[PDB]
Write an enzyme that holds these catalytic residues in place. Sequence first.
Site, short mmCIF file in Angstrom:
data_model
loop_
_atom_site.label_atom_id
_atom_site.label_comp_id
_atom_site.label_asym_id
_atom_site.label_seq_id
_atom_site.Cartn_x
_atom_site.Cartn_y
_atom_site.Cartn_z
N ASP A 1 -17.24 -1.48 1.39
CA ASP A 1 -16.02 -0.69 1.33
C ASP A 1 -15.57 -0.59 -0.13
O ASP A 1 -16.15 -1.24 -1.02
CB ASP A 1 -14.93 -1.22 2.27
CG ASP A 1 -14.13 -2.39 1.70
OD1 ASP A 1 -14.68 -3.17 0.90
OD2 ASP A 1 -12.95 -2.53 2.11
N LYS B 1 -3.00 -6.66 -3.21
CA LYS B 1 -3.29 -7.84 -2.39
C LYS B 1 -2.95 -9.06 -3.24
O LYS B 1 -3.35 -9.16 -4.40
CB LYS B 1 -4.74 -7.83 -1.94
CG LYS B 1 -5.11 -6.55 -1.20
CD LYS B 1 -6.47 -6.63 -0.57
CE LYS B 1 -6.85 -5.30 0.09
NZ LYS B 1 -8.10 -5.39 0.92
N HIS C 1 -14.54 -7.92 7.59
CA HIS C 1 -14.23 -9.00 6.67
C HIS C 1 -14.90 -10.30 7.17
O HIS C 1 -14.68 -10.72 8.31
CB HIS C 1 -12.71 -9.20 6.57
CG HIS C 1 -11.99 -8.11 5.85
ND1 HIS C 1 -11.40 -7.04 6.51
CD2 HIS C 1 -11.70 -7.95 4.54
CE1 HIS C 1 -10.81 -6.26 5.62
NE2 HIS C 1 -10.97 -6.79 4.42
N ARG D 1 0.85 -1.19 0.00
CA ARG D 1 0.00 0.00 0.00
C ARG D 1 0.88 1.24 0.00
O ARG D 1 1.82 1.33 0.80
CB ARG D 1 -0.89 0.02 1.25
CG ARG D 1 -1.98 1.09 1.25
CD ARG D 1 -3.14 0.73 0.32
NE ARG D 1 -3.74 -0.56 0.67
CZ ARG D 1 -4.66 -0.74 1.63
NH1 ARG D 1 -5.10 0.29 2.35
NH2 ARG D 1 -5.13 -1.95 1.88
N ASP E 1 -14.50 -6.18 -0.23
CA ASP E 1 -14.23 -7.32 0.64
C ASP E 1 -14.72 -7.11 2.08
O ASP E 1 -14.55 -7.99 2.92
CB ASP E 1 -12.75 -7.68 0.64
CG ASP E 1 -11.88 -6.54 1.06
OD1 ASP E 1 -12.42 -5.43 1.36
OD2 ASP E 1 -10.65 -6.75 1.07
N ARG E 2 -15.31 -5.95 2.35
CA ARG E 2 -15.94 -5.66 3.65
C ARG E 2 -17.36 -5.14 3.42
O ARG E 2 -17.62 -4.41 2.45
CB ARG E 2 -15.15 -4.60 4.42
CG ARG E 2 -13.73 -4.99 4.79
CD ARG E 2 -13.13 -4.02 5.80
NE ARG E 2 -12.79 -2.72 5.23
CZ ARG E 2 -13.29 -1.55 5.62
NH1 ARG E 2 -14.16 -1.44 6.63
NH2 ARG E 2 -12.90 -0.45 4.99
N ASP F 1 -13.27 -1.63 -2.15
CA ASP F 1 -12.92 -2.77 -2.98
C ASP F 1 -13.85 -3.99 -2.78
O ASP F 1 -13.67 -5.01 -3.44
CB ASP F 1 -11.43 -3.14 -2.79
CG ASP F 1 -11.10 -3.58 -1.38
OD1 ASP F 1 -11.64 -2.98 -0.45
OD2 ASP F 1 -10.28 -4.51 -1.22
N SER G 1 -8.07 -0.23 -1.26
CA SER G 1 -9.12 -0.56 -0.31
C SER G 1 -10.10 0.61 -0.05
O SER G 1 -10.86 0.99 -0.96
CB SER G 1 -8.47 -1.10 0.99
OG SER G 1 -9.44 -1.35 1.99
N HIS G 2 -10.06 1.19 1.14
CA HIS G 2 -10.97 2.28 1.50
C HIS G 2 -10.23 3.62 1.66
O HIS G 2 -10.83 4.61 2.07
CB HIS G 2 -11.70 1.94 2.80
CG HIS G 2 -10.79 1.84 3.99
ND1 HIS G 2 -10.38 2.94 4.71
CD2 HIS G 2 -10.20 0.77 4.57
CE1 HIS G 2 -9.58 2.55 5.69
NE2 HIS G 2 -9.46 1.24 5.63
#
Length: 455
Positions: free
Chosen positions: A234, A110, A321, A12, A238-239, A236, A100-101
């Site tokens: 979120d 990832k 997650h 990141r 995944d949450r 991407d 991500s967020h």
Amino acid sequence: LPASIFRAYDIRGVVGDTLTAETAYWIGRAIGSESLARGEPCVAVGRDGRLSGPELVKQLIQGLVDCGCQVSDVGMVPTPVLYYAANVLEGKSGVMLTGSHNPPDYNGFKIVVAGETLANEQIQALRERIEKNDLASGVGSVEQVDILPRYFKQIRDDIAMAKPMKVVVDCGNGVAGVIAPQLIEALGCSVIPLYCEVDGNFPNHHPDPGKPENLKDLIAKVKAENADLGLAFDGDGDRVGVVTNTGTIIYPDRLLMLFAKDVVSRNPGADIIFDVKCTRRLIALISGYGGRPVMWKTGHSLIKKKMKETGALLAGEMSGHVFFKERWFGFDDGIYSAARLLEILSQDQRDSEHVFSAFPSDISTPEINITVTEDSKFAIIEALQRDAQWGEGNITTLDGVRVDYPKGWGLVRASNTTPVLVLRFEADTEEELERIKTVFRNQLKAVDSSLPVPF
Ligand SMILES: O=P([O-])(O)O[C@H]1O[C@H](COP(=O)(O)O)[C@@H](O)[C@H](O)[C@H]1O
Ligand SMILES: [Zn+2]
């Protein structure tokens, strides 16, 4: 390449600053080399809706190609769809280009190699490859693959919703908007969309359903439209965050109570994994239905690894997650978890508020953060682990120090990414809470009397 972008569970960085096109190329080169070293030439590549996605993804792919990898470029997709691709395509390797967020200029990677999601030393070894030029060279290939329709049909086919539901869906202008509203509708819902246009400028709220402030619009809309449920994804995908028909926020540990009841109902003795920040009511609940509760460390890669090692059919953690292996593939997926939730709630005549309010609830403190220094944060925890006295505590030291008492618990841990101590406290009585809080305050003060304990 800067060492700081190579983190515990991912890569990141800031695309203007610490993450360049050149860096992205060499990261692709390191990933490809490692996939080949594990016998896997075939690598899926996906990206989120960020503004830098195009410029960076081309470098990532070229790096993989310059190793001799056979790349399957699945375009712009949610993170779980990339994980899906790396489970159903030929190869068991995959790279998701995502921030991500985080704010617009953040991006990252990832990484799954031959089935395993990389963490800690494995990520640092990628960097090490670049520093030492320990890199494969070859003439790879790129194939375009359109995987979304297949992912869509996979979920749609296995979910069996009973009653109809009206659902507000907030994608926060992240990449979940490409599928979550359409998939949820197809399951048998009416979808009220919020911020479902993909826009990497993120001109409305940040796509982070963990913070209540990014759920304000969702809650208001659920109430104003008399909806059965609100869902927030979120950036991407995944949450997922969840709110009831009355606007109550349902945290992942409480979400897992419903999911565990369901999974264990069909799988006696199933291992169910959760993290050290989850309510002790989840532990009792899992055990009471005959499941095997496994408390583990915070993370996503760590929970994912633990799932593989234990044979667990379900895992979750407090950042939202949720990992289904039963009827699924074992990776974190907010979109599939949403489907699984809608499936269960559609089979209950009660509203979502009552389904969730039926489970027991302790008095919880909002999560507490204490800013210390980068030099001291791990040492403070190590000192507590050495010197602290907690009485008959049931002490857990997998991730900081958690102490479970008969009627409550407390946790202190060091943030991996920030110079911060993170604490949570929960008890059945307000008296118990203030007692557990009192103990932790005392033990922190015994390490450093000058530490700012704000409870
Ligand atoms: O790093 P920790 O241990 O404080 O953990 C916290 O921050 C991490 C990094 O956040 P970000 O990706 O925005 O930098 C998150 O993955 C994690 O879920 C959160 O609980
Ligand atoms: Zn995410």
